[PDB]
Amino acid sequence: SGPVPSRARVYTDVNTHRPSEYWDYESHVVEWGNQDDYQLVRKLGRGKYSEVFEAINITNNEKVVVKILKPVKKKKIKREIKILENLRGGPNIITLADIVKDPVSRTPALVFEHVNNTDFKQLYQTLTDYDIRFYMYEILKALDYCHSMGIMHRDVKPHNVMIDHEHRKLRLIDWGLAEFYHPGQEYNVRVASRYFKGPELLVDYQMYDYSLDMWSLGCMLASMIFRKEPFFHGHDNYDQLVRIAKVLGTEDLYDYIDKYNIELDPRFNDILGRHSRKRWERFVHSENQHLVSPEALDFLDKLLRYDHQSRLTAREAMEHPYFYTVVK
Numbered sequence: 001s002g003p004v005p006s007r008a009r010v011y012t013d014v015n016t017h018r019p020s021e022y023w024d025y026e027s028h029v030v031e032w033g034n035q036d037d038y039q040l041v042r043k044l045g046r047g048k049y050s051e052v053f054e055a056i057n058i059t060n061n062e063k064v065v066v067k068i069l070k071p072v073k074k075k076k077i078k079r080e081i082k083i084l085e086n087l088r089g090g091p092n093i094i095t096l097a098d099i100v101k102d103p104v105s106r107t108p109a110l111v112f113e114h115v116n117n118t119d120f121k122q123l124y125q126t127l128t129d130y131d132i133r134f135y136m137y138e139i140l141k142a143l144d145y146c147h148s149m150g151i152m153h154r155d156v157k158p159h160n161v162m163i164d165h166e167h168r169k170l171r172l173i174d175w176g177l178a179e180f181y182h183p184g185q186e187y188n189v190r191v192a193s194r195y196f197k198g199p200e201l202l203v204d205y206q207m208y209d210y211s212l213d214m215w216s217l218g219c220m221l222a223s224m225i226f227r228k229e230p231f232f233h234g235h236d237n238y239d240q241l242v243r244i245a246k247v248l249g250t251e252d253l254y255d256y257i258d259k260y261n262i263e264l265d266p267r268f269n270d271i272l273g274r275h276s277r278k279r280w281e282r283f284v285h286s287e288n289q290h291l292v293s294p295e296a297l298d299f300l301d302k303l304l305r306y307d308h309q310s311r312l313t314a315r316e317a318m319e320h321p322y323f324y325t326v327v328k
């Protein structure tokens with residue numbers, strides 16, 4: 001009969017009950033200001049189809065972040081703009097400040113609030129158990145907010161989380177893969193970055209939801225508390241599911257596929273094998289034991305589940321005992 005349908009356990013109908021102006025990004029009117037108010041300072045990084053710069057707004061002498069987009073697909077640029085406008089001012093969401101075009105090259109560019117990203121590789125051995133709980137809670141505030149606004153981020157990973165450690169300030173960035181959640185909709189599974197892809201994407205289950213972001217968040221938590229980056233080290237999209245199965249086991253994978261009547265791709269035939277369900281305590285070592293606790297492992301166990309419906313929502317996660325020590 002094909003795959004079994006699924007819907008989000010929370011914020012299911014938030015877009016259904018809003019006028020088209022909110023979620024119909026193709027009809028949104030963009031007003032492209034003048035790029036001359038900004039002067040580019042330095043390159044911060046380069047993505048698939050974008051280049052990010054530190055810049056200065058010459059009218060007020062304030063630093064900003066400018067993301068120059070390679071306009072390969074206009075519909076995708078309109079989607080990112082509409083989502084950023086909808087989420088503007090949400091907790092720990094990057095703030096869109098302007099939208100401009102090069103008067104001469106006419107290449108689109110998004111102008112954001114400035115974020116002072118602390119370099120981390122240096123201070124990952126510096127983070128304490130408390131710091132991980134604190135920043136995980138700040139990410140959860142951003143996710144509960146965007147999910148409540150009917151948006152899935154679909155690219156949660158450390159590169160998309162900027163932290164200014166000195167000011168204990170976090171921003172969830174790069175909403176280029178974000179999408180509006182509409183119950184029953186079949187989405188493209190070619191989203192997120194390999195190590196953070198949820199099992200739903202790897203088995204080509206298209207009717208996914210906000211819970212995809214909770215899987216990605218679980219991958220980040222596991223890599224931080226265990227000092228293992230990435231946690232699930234796949235070499236391709238099929239091998240990525242095998243890396244997950246080497247931890248969660250193959251029995252629960254078949255229960256997940258059976259529950260949703262998913263047809264497993266033949267490419268899994270010779271590589272999946274048989275794997276027992278591992279105890280999370282097996283990843284604890286002398287290098288990471290100061291970051292691990294029974295609460296952390298119980299919280300991680302509740303995010304890293306094959307069944308997208310069984311994972312904690314962002315609001316349920318914020319109520320977990322792991323966060324009893326953080327201000328809420």
Ligand SMILES: COC(=O)CC(=O)NCCCNCc1ccc(-c2ccccc2)c(Cl)c1
Nearest residue numbers: 044045052120132135136158159161220224
């Ligand atoms: C393209 O240039 C840009 O503007 C992007 C850009 O500058 N990105 C730099 C990525 C910064 N990442 C740092 C970081 C550190 C710790 C965590 C963390 C993970 C789990 C639990 C607690 C904290 C995360 Cl999510 C991120």
